[PDB]
């Protein structure tokens, strides 16, 4: 299958530099134009530029917003695409996508494959690991078909963090709220709803991962006793 995987994202100082990578497999890399597209948290997609295919000499083009500041290149031996960013600023904070563009002008068009994206934050605020607290039912744990539990993920920087339940096995009935920033620190909570017959009979644990600080923590939800 066609595979596109971005890497290299992280936290960088304003005025700093960063080079993102995109590893590909599953198709003849040299036959394709490759594009980079970014997207701030909850904003629109913005095309940044591309590098053409082999018959086109691997030449490059850029959006007026980053031309002269960003540089696209590629390693045809390893089938890897790169994006070198310079003199970074707050407006450059976003999720960056690697995308397979056209291989032929006459047969078709469109960016038919997209990676999952890699996150970038430009800030001078320091990296801080989150504290994870359990949100357990107290007087609840009664009789009413379903029960809702949660995990509070507080005081971290920068975004993002990923929250799963029971290592991913528990996926339905789960939603995580958007983080809120305050004084250089983010906070969010995750909610999970399961039938009373499954908890606390069977365990429920939230798994929290914060790559920027290389942290991965677990928090088992135990019912409150009083």
């Amino acid at each position: 299958e066609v595979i596109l995987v971005e890497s290299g994202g992280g936290l960088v100082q304003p005025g700093g530099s960063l080079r993102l990578s995109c590893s590909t497999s599953g198709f003849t890399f040299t036959d394709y134009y490759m594009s980079w597209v970014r997207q701030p948290p909850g904003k629109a997609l913005e095309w940044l530029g591309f590098i053409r295919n082999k018959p086109k000499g691997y030449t490059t083009e850029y959006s007026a917003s980053v031309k002269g500041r960003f540089t696209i290149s590629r390693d045809n031996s390893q089938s890897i695409l790169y994006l070198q960013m310079n003199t970074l600023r707050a407006e450059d904070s976003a999720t960056y996508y690697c995308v397979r563009d056209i291989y032929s002008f006459g047969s078709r068009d469109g960016m038919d494959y997209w990676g999952q994206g890699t996150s970038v934050t430009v800030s001078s605020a320091k990296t801080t690991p989150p504290s994870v607290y359990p949100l357990a039912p107290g007087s609840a744990a009664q009789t009413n078909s379903m029960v809702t539990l949660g995990c509070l993920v507080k005081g971290y920087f920068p975004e993002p963090v990923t929250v799963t339940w029971n290592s991913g096995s528990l996926s339905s009935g789960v939603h995580t709220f958007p983080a809120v920033l305050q004084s250089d620190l983010y906070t969010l909570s995750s909610s999970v709803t399961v039938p009373s017959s499954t908890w606390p009979s069977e365990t429920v644990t939230c798994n929290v991962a914060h790559p920027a600080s290389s942290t991965k923590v677990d928090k088992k939800i135990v019912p409150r006793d009083c």
């Binding site: 594009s35 597209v37 629109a44 997609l45 913005e46 095309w47 530029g49 591309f50 083009e61 959006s63 007026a64 996508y97 056209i102 078709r108 068009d109 469109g110 960016m111 038919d112 997209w114 990676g115 999952q116 994206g117 504290s131 607290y133 359990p134 949100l135 357990a136 039912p137 107290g138 007087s139 609840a140 809702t148 949660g150 509070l152 507080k154 939603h175 995580t176 709220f177 958007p178 983080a179 809120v180 305050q182 906070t187 969010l188 909570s189 909610s191 709803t193 409150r224 009083c226």
Partner: protein, 219 residues
């Protein structure tokens, strides 16, 4: 640069109904040699990467349901969805490829459903958090509709507003509801000089709020 405009930028419809989205370009995207307009549509569901739906203005990408149809030429284009389904919930972007590439600002599609009351849960600060000097009281207002809703905090029966942070999730693909959290953050000392904590949810489907609370002395 060719500027792409998508207005209206937000649309709401019930499943089974027709939907048409607009995309206009500041310059023509019609190539006089090929007699095709270089415009594409992409679908981005909540939290996922985008997916190509249509290119060359009206050509459907492989694997795309016939429910989606693209049309238009020159500077005016539209994307139509025959019969909208709950799973079509997403933000749709158009993109020109006539000269380099440029995306429009997107049109967010919302699914209309029966009004629903939220399921409310309140949580006291955890013992683990207290042992640090902080006290966060959390309230979940889950799976309701419409999106608009109000939350009111009361300490010992008195309303509190300073120190409250609210956050709404995007609409859920399955069930088409929304959810939101309300978090009241105090210091441990502040938390300990009061006893009753209450979260009140007032929705567009309530003559009386949905109330949840706890007494600190009952632990």
């Amino acid at each position: 640069d060719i500027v792409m405009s998508q207005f209206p930028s937000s649309l709401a419809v019930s499943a089974g109904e027709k939907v048409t989205m607009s995309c206009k370009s500041s310059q023509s995207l019609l190539n006089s040699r090929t007699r095709k307009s270089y415009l594409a549509w992409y679908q981005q569901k909540p939290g996922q990467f985008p997916k190509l739906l249509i290119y060359w203005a009206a050509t459907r990408e492989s694997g795309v349901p016939d429910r989606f149809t693209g049309s238009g030429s020159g500077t005016d284009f539209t994307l139509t969805i025959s019969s909208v389904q709950a799973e079509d919930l997403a933000v749709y972007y158009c993109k020109q490829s006539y000269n380099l590439r440029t995306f429009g600002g997107g049109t967010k599609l919302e699914i209309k459903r029966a009004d629903a009351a939220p399921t409310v849960s309140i949580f006291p600060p955890s013992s683990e958090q207290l042992t640090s000097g902080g006290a966060s009281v959390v309230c979940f207002l889950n799976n309701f509709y419409p999106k608009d809703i109000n939350v009111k905090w009361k300490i010992d029966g008195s309303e509190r507003q300073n120190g409250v942070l609210n956050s709404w999730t995007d609409q859920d693909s399955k069930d088409s509801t929304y959810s939101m959290s309300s978090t009241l953050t105090l210091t441990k000392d502040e938390y300990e000089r009061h006893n009753s904590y209450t979260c009140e949810a007032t929705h567009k489907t309530s003559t009386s709020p949905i109330v949840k609370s706890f007494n600190r002395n009952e632990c």
